[PDB]
Design a protein around this ligand. Structure first.
Ligand code: CPQ
Ligand code: CPQ
Ligand code: CL
Ligand code: CL
Ligand code: ZN
Ligand code: ZN
Ligand code: ZN
Ligand code: ZN
Ligand code: ZN
Ligand code: ZN
Ligand code: ZN
Ligand code: ZN
Lengths: 127, 136, 127, 136
């Protein structure tokens, strides 16, 4: 019987399974990285570092919490991020709804913190 | 030790290597399937959000150049611009349109999430963007 | 008795009264001219030539009837008057209320015409 | 015709001139008072509108650089700009302020009407404009 051939076939099987695993790991890491980038870098208010609460979008296309941008605007009428003079504000149902859905998949600590801020800021639109 | 015993130990030694390799193989498969599940769960989350929160109600596609109206509703720039050739009112709430604002956060979130989905999904979006920018 | 002096005093009295009258006439004409200028040149919509109905003011500071500017905007997104790209609209309670008060002092023909257009355009804000 | 008769006709001729002049004088006064009434009626109309429709609720003056908010309420530019240093909400309806738009029609109407009022009223406005533009 070819004992050497049995070992070589088991070794290739193992090598194949390892590369499959390493690929799946890189794919997993890439997706999570991208998800976290969205959470941390797109959906967090630059003024308060929280996920937007009652998101408002300015004429310059940047978004902020309603509470945050109003406090800012009492002192300065330039977008915090791009410094263009602020000419319009609008609330964004889609951003609020997207954020609620995303946050719903996070830890109950994160979820409860968000609830506390919402009530603390009297953020009515998030019923 | 005599051939029957020497044969038996050589068999045990060979089998121990095979079994060590099968244990590694099995464990590697389990780690692979775990990361596959972890990946799929995040992909499921992205699909849920994209399909149920980030689709334009007019075209049913993920927003392409998302714009937000004064009434807080959002649409593709193309779709609302076509709508406004006939009615200056929100397709959803029918309030008079007073302002239209591009939303970078919506666009970046969509672009970043879609980048993780299949080639078929990514390509459709690229085609749709090209179609909408094309001259007519 | 000085008959010549009686005639001269009556003549001066008359001359004084005539100049007073001519001054009052010029003042009267000036005020009316200004009132009509406001009515005809400030409070009339350039698109429909009616006193504004449901006045809307654009980012460029020009005002139009709501109905008129919406029809315009289906075809062009430039202010009719200054041709700047339209970026915002807002209704104006003060303009509507001012116009109602002014029109209230005009003929019942003008008042009834305005009522007809309001209902014809379904101009809700003017209850 | 004899002196009594010649005297009498000379008296009648003199009196006829005086009476013709008094008739003219009386008629001229009536035309003057009529135009005075016509003028005052238009001035009353302007005052009614200015006082009851074109005053800023914050300062009680006729609007100086009128601005209109998204909620359709108007204020002086100076007054709303000062208010917004403390609250980003309409002083009248308390809605969140989303836009602030200068209104040429309001400004031109005020300027044109005020130009017909007393020197005292016109001067106060000029002073107030100067005060608000002054550095501080
Ligand atoms: C969209 C319409 C076809 C479908 C249709 O024929 N109806 C609408 C059905 C709804 N579905 C969609 O629109 C789809 O999402 C598409 O946009 C789809 O995404 C495309 O494949 C992508 O490009 C029905 C016709 C009536 N339309 C209405 O939308 C209803 O009246 C309704 O909304 C009510 O007004 C409202 O709900 C109140 O109850 C077609 C038919 C005629 C087209 C206009 C021709 C003249 C002008 C040419 C200019 O160069 C562009 C502007 C345009 C005004 C045109 C716009 C648009 O192109 C029209 C309306
Ligand atoms: C207006 C206030 C004095 C009168 C006052 O002391 N109160 C308001 C009374 C209302 N009357 C008026 O404002 C008048 O119309 C004046 O504006 C008048 O026209 C001037 O003579 C013309 O220049 C009471 C204090 C509380 N203020 C309120 O307005 C109430 O809280 C009320 O509105 C409620 O918030 C609301 O109704 C909710 O119920 C004074 C007192 C302290 C001042 C701030 C100091 C610090 C900052 C300096 C900056 O360089 C400019 C910004 C500023 C935030 C200042 C703004 C303003 O200058 C203030 C508020
Ligand atoms: Cl700027
Ligand atoms: Cl422009
Ligand atoms: Zn914030
Ligand atoms: Zn910005
Ligand atoms: Zn769309
Ligand atoms: Zn809407
Ligand atoms: Zn009009
Ligand atoms: Zn204009
Ligand atoms: Zn004021
Ligand atoms: Zn208001």
């Amino acid at each position: 019987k070819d004992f050497e051939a049995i070992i070589q076939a088991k070794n290739k099987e193992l090598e194949q399974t390892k590369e499959e695993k390493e690929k799946m790991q890189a794919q997993k890491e890439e997706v999570l990285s991208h998800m976290n980038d969205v959470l941390e870098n797109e959906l967090q208010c630059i003024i308060c570092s929280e996920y937007f609460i009652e998101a408002v979008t300015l004429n310059c296309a940047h978004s902020f919490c309603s509470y945050c941008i109003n406090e800012w605007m009492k002192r300065k009428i330039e977008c915090p991020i791009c410094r263009k003079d602020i000419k319009s504000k609008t609330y964004s149902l889609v951003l609020d709804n997207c954020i609620n859905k995303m946050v719903n998949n996070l830890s109950s600590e994160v979820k409860e913190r968000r609830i506390v801020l919402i009530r603390e800021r009297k953020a009515k639109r998030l019923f």
